[PDB]
Design a protein around this ligand. Structure first.
Ligand SMILES: CC[C@H](C)[C@H](NC(=O)[C@H](C)NC(=O)[C@@H](CCSC)NC[C@@H](N)Cc1ccccc1)C(=O)O
Length: 330
């Protein structure tokens, strides 16, 4: 079996991507943010504090005939964002682009942080990291990918995010039509439960490639690209007027400047991120200062290859017995 769904940016800056998901019977369609950095499938619902919902589409378990409450089960999640959500759990049928999974854990939100309430275009999240990260207790739950694995033609899923355009999420197969050249696979570490890999180095613009090991995680749930201070400094030094602002909390640059591309290494292969992808617009409406798409990870504790880097390639998440990450140009 297979599945394929279209993913769309929530705004003109590609802050996040939403993908339609069918939950329950009859089907209740909600637009979820596919997160390969988390392992929980939560959605705004009829249980969510009325004051905490502002325009989102909610899931009403009572209206689904396949919905069943998982007695005593609760959940609580926190994001690197400072974001948080919690509530109860139900089991229901979930379908993504034609691929159906029965008995999937659907975490119903009773409480949602302000950040979420503010985002009217996101109805919930669908975690695609490893199940060891699930926050359901006392009994931990498996992710949607984990539940489909068995039925997939291949235990894989691909990420093809678009730049200021719609993209695709495929389950069970590799569209050899979506990329150019060959796919370069790299080893993945599951120790921390993330799609953790090691990049072989980087290059700034037409500059010489620097061979250095960069351990980070492929996270579709993160907007930007977070790298070590040394690397980030080398990139920004090439942009006239660019500088780190303590008030803004990151590197900013004159909106009129032209950004150089950024190259990251994958084995002997190289993925080039056009400078256009790094521009995050005016820090504030009307401002002549723009926010950079490449920031330091000094305060995060881990390097993150977010949407900024991921959208520049065709990404294969091989969930085989020995997980691997595949990268290809497109
Ligand atoms: C960063 C530290 C937090 C607290 C950590 N949580 C995590 O690692 C969770 C699973 N994953 C995440 O926080 C991140 C992974 C990067 S750091 C590990 N997943 C992407 C994420 N931004 C989800 C999101 C999407 C839209 C809006 C907001 C947030 C924890 O449990 O300790």
């Amino acid at each position: 079996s297979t599945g394929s769904a279209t993913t769309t940016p929530i705004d003109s800056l590609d802050d996040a991507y939403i993908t339609p998901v069918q939950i329950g019977t009859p089907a209740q369609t909600l637009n979820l943010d596919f997160d390969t950095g988390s392992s929980d499938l939560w959605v705004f619902s009829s249980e969510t504090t009325a004051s905490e919902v502002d325009g989102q589409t909610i899931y009403t378990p009572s209206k689904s005939t396949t919905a069943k409450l998982l007695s005593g089960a609760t959940w609580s999640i926190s994001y690197g964002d400072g974001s948080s959500s919690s509530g109860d759990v139900y089991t229901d049928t979930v379908s993504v682009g034609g691929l159906t999974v029965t008995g999937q854990a659907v975490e119903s939100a009773k409480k949602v942080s302000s950040s979420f309430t503010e985002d009217s275009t996101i109805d919930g999240l669908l975690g695609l990291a490893f199940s060891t990260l699930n926050t359901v207790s006392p009994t931990q739950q498996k992710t949607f990918f984990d539940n489909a694995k068995a039925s997939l033609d291949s235990p894989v899923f691909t990420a093809d995010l678009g730049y200021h355009a719609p993209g695709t999420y495929n389950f069970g197969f590799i569209d050899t039509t979506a990329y150019t050249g060959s796919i370069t696979y790299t080893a993945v570490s599951t120790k921390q439960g993330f799609w953790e890999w090691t990049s072989t180095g980087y290059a700034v613009g037409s500059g010489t490639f620097k061979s250095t090991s960069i351990d980070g995680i492929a996270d579709t749930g993160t907007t930007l690209l977070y790298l070590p201070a040394t690397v980030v400094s080398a990139y920004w030094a090439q942009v006239s007027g660019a500088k780190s602002s303590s008030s803004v909390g990151g590197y900013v640059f004159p909106c009129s400047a032209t950004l150089p591309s950024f190259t990251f290494g994958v084995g002997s292969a190289r993925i080039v991120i056009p400078g256009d992808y790094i521009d995050f617009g005016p820090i504030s409406t009307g401002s002549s200062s723009c926010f950079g798409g490449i920031q330091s990870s000094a305060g995060i504790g881990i390097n993150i290859f977010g949407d900024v880097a991921l959208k520049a390639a065709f990404v294969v998440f091989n969930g085989a017995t020995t997980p691997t990450l595949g990268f290809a140009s497109k």
